Amino acid sequence: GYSDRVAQLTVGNSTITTQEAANIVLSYGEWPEYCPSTDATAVDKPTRPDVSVNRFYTLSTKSWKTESTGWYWKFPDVLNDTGVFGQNAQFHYLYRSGFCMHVQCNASKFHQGALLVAAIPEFVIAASSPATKPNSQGLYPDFAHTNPGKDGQEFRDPYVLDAGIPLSQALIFPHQWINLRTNNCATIIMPYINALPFDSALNHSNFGLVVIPISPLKYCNGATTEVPITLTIAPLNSEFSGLRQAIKQ
């Protein structure tokens, strides 16, 4: 009637073990699934590279500091240039997949702090304008802030999620905390959420993956200062259709 603290996630040829885990969030209670023939629209037979792309990718490691604001990634964008998944996303026009995001952050029993790990669908990034009216360039964010790639982008104003919506209500999204006194990882399984059965993995980013330190990292002199945060993700039930020449962006 409870959840065990140890867990092991095996998909593809990758395996992730954790010994201080809270639980596994199944976003909106739906598992990732292939597109049913009742909901599909494209007539080309999709390709399903089962184990070559549905596997864990350790992508970026950010160092948690006491004055850190947080970072965010975009799920299809962060994997577009890595492994067999990136190739299929570049060679095919259409794409759909879920994922299992796994954020890892361990620290001693003498550190403290809490991260908010949330998976935000359609995480449209806002630009903060200096009250300028005449539709200046500073009215829209550049491409580096909308599609950060695999390095991610650190928040400018985490209080409003860089989107004008309050951070306090971000818990309405599938989320999980990394409380250093309780757990050292956060797992979120997210199904493919989109108004279309398939979509371009290059233009459209289905989910934003934010990691925001709510309670700042604090420790005393003598403890390890470099406390990293590693983001490992894995596509689930990924399909591709509409083969053509490989397109980078």
Partner: protein, 292 residues
């Protein structure tokens, strides 16, 4: 027959959850108060397990909090001025249909990410002094790709296929029901992406977030007149949403909007909660303590 159908149309009441009676509990291993918020799940603690409650057969109705009732309320979505006086003797105007121009309708709509619905549009048109003389107006809906009018006499007003409504100002407000018109399965108030391929290295990057599945053409409005009338007409467009389906709820907007089609907040971020003196002050005087 269908008499049973029409009889079962009144809004049936479903009540809120009842509270069962409970007693004190003294033991170990049973801790309904201790939770683990890190799991991302809300606490499942009940009142019955934290205090001693009574049996309350709750009869408060919950039907008003449904998505339909929350949205099926006509709000202002567009103000169109048919200028026909002064420097602009047009007598017509083509308004791009976008329901994100006014805060009250916009904030409610952005509660959800995707929405699929039909709409009932109502047009409240009048002069500047609020009067409504008999003046024949034509509200033509121009779907995306249809030729847009460029004058009060151009051929597009023939409307041989475009749906068009003719109504005087003195008539009751015209009202039409519009289906769910979109190439997608649902309208998408938030589209984290770009409509076209490319480098997206532009200086402005105004195309970010513009999903053409939401762009549903224009509403062309004109006075059916032979020449200039010298009177400006204001058409207020009200949209009532029906047969609603919402997906992926979002946080309600906290910063003030700045532009129509983009989330863009000022650099002076306003706090979600109003400030108070300290963390231990509340403004509730209460009563006089019996024995301080």
């Amino acid at each position: 027959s269908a008499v049973s159908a029409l009889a079962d149309t009144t809004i049936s009441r479903v009540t809120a959850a009842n509270t069962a009676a409970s007693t004190h509990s003294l033991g170990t291993g049973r801790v309904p108060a201790l939770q683990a918020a890190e799991t991302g799940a809300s606490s499942n603690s009940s009142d019955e397990n934290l205090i001693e409650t009574r049996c309350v057969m709750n009869r408060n109705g919950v039907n008003e909090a449904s998505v339909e009732h929350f949205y099926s309320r006509a709000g202002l979505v567009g103000v169109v001025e048919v200028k026909d006086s002064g420097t602009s003797l047009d007598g017509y105007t083509v308004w791009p249909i976008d329901v994100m121009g006014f805060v009250q309708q916009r904030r409610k709509l952005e509660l959800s990410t995707y929405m699929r619905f039909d709409a009932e549009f109502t047009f409240v048109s009048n002069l500047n002094n609020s009067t409504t003389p008999g003046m024949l107006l034509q509200y033509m809906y121009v779907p995306p790709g249809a030729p847009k009018p460029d004058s009060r006499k151009s051929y597009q007003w023939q409307t041989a296929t475009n749906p068009s409504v003719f109504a005087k100002l003195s008539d009751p407000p015209p009202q039409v029901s519009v289906p769910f018109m979109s190439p997608a399965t649902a309208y998408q108030w938030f589209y984290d992406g770009y409509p076209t391929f490319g480098e997206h290295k532009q200086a402005t990057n105004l195309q970010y977030g513009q999903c053409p599945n939401n762009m549903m053409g224009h509403f062309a409005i004109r006075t059916v007149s032979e020449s200039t009338t010298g009177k400006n007409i204001h058409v207020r467009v009200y949209m009532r949403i029906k047969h609603v389906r919402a997906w992926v709820p979002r946080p309600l907007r906290s910063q003030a909007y700045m532009v129509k089609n983009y989330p863009t907040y000022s650099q002076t971020i306003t706090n979600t909660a109003t400030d108070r003196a300290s963390i231990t002050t509340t403004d509730y005087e209460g009563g006089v303590p019996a024995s301080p």
